Amino acid sequence: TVPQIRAPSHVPFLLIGGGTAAFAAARSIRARDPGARVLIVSEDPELPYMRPPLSKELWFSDDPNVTKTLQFRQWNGKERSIYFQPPSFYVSAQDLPNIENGGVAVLTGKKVVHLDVRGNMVKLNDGSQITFEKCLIATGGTPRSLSAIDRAGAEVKSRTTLFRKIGDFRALEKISREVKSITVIGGGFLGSELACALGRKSQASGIEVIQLFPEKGNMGKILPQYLSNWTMEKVKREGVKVMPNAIVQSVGVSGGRLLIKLKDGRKVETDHIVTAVGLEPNVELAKTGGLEIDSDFGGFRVNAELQARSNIWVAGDAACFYDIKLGRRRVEHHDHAVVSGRLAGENMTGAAKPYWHQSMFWSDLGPDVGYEAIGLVDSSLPTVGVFAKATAQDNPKSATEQSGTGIRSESETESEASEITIPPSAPAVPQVPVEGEDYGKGVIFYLRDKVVVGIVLWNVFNRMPIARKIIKDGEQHEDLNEVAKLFNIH
Ligand SMILES: Cc1cc2nc3c(=O)[nH]c(=O)nc-3n(C[C@H](O)[C@H](O)[C@H](O)COP(=O)(O)OP(=O)(O)OC[C@H]3O[C@@H](n4cnc5c(N)ncnc54)[C@H](O)[C@@H]3O)c2cc1C
């Protein structure tokens, strides 16, 4: 067996990229047009898989075999495959045009590098060509790097990982068992999940874990300062040296270790760096395809139907879409990937439906801390937070036990509450006098006009439909403590 040239071929439905959005689009097309012939072409050799477990549950397991099988343990102890479907669900490219009732084929280890819109064709990196009738671009993005690491030498670039894939979890996991110290650069949800995860391994290994970022505290661009600060102390307590207000001036090699120099005088000595500083949408096809990239937000600009050009749609992290409440925007949400992929797939079969979904986001920092967000969440906005003591059910683990899944967009559902009526206050709880240290859950309302434009929920689950409805209706609430009763915050 030797390398060979693929003959030109044709496929009714071509999906460029094999991630969450591509997979959801393939199922949608198959549901809408039974017998459909769908081909996914994907650069990474792996079959389609969900990403959330990579910075999360896969680090919380004592079984060495999980790194190989990727059958991760949810917080409720129940196993789940990181893959959407196993190999048997798919067919090979070669067989697709001949199989009865059609199917979903997958061609991994191949990259589409040229899109010809008017000729309905693409070219792969190996020179072969595939004509299509309908095409979805769902190429995701590539992790951003740090400028200082880019200007940095071979030695340091060889000791920095960007965190996005299976390969990254595997390498970072191995490194956590080989070196004395690892630094996470990035204060966002993802960098924070990685810090907690290594801090947990640290309990057994004794490795040093540092997390550094330029904000005053974790997720500082998103959470109000008080909760950002609470969060920062929480992460630190997982055994992480957190360094806020840190701007990387340069990185170099000293003593055989990495030497990161900060603008303010500080210096960090460490053996490996993982960055989590955001994403660049994969838009290389915009050029041959004559597609518009959004100059303000990045990604492919699409219309209400997720369409970019004739017979071309985009979904997932790669799309700059028109949010029904916020206007042009792009997100990195698992929910959006699934919903938008499904809708694109439906539109590929002729539906012409607008994307009116309000995408949600969630983050877990271990089984005991969970956040959910929706709409415009920006710490520069005026905000109203309402809090209460947590009940036993108010944590990511219980939310996983109740629903049987850890992927929060699944358990929350994609729906929107049909009506909002402020329920009666709950029965009084006999208690000693309550202090701020005693709260463990809450809702934070983000405002613009006296209208709620965004919501972050802290340890409140199964209420996302209600948060969607409050944001959609756009009422001026006279008293947000009454509305918080909708989130069982009393
Ligand atoms: C580690 C991590 C944890 C996360 N946790 C959460 C969370 O808990 N909650 C939440 O809401 N969201 C979370 N997210 C975000 C969510 O997983 C993403 O929004 C989602 O993966 C985007 O899916 P996609 O299909 O749009 O893009 P991708 O998943 O990136 O898929 C794109 C695929 O296309 C391939 N590709 C790119 N270019 C080409 C090309 N030209 N030709 C062929 N193939 C190509 C790439 O190899 C890639 O496989 C997390 C993300 C990461 C990385």
UniProtKB/Swiss-Prot annotation:
Which gene name does the record give?
Aifm1
First-to-last residue of the parent protein present: 122 to 610 of 612
Q: What is the lineage of its organism?
A: Eukaryota, Metazoa, Chordata, Craniata, Vertebrata
Q: What is this protein called?
A: Apoptosis-inducing factor 1, mitochondrial
Chief location of this protein within or outside the cell: mitochondrion
- Compartmental location: Mitochondrion intermembrane space; Mitochondrion inner membrane; Cytoplasm; Nucleus
Q: Which residues bind FAD?
A: 17-21, 43-44, 51, 56, 112, 164, 317, 333-334, 362
Residue(s) carrying Phosphoserine: 147, 250, 403, 409
Residues that the record marks as modified (N6-acetyllysine) are 267, 472
Quick one: which residues bind NAD(+) 2?
Answer: 75, 372, 462
* Result after altering residue 56 to A: Increases catalytic efficiency
Keywords on record: Acetylation, Apoptosis, Cytoplasm, DNA-binding, FAD, Flavoprotein, Isopeptide bond, Membrane, Mitochondrion, Mitochondrion inner membrane, NAD, Nucleus, Oxidoreductase, Phosphoprotein, Transit peptide, Ubl conjugation
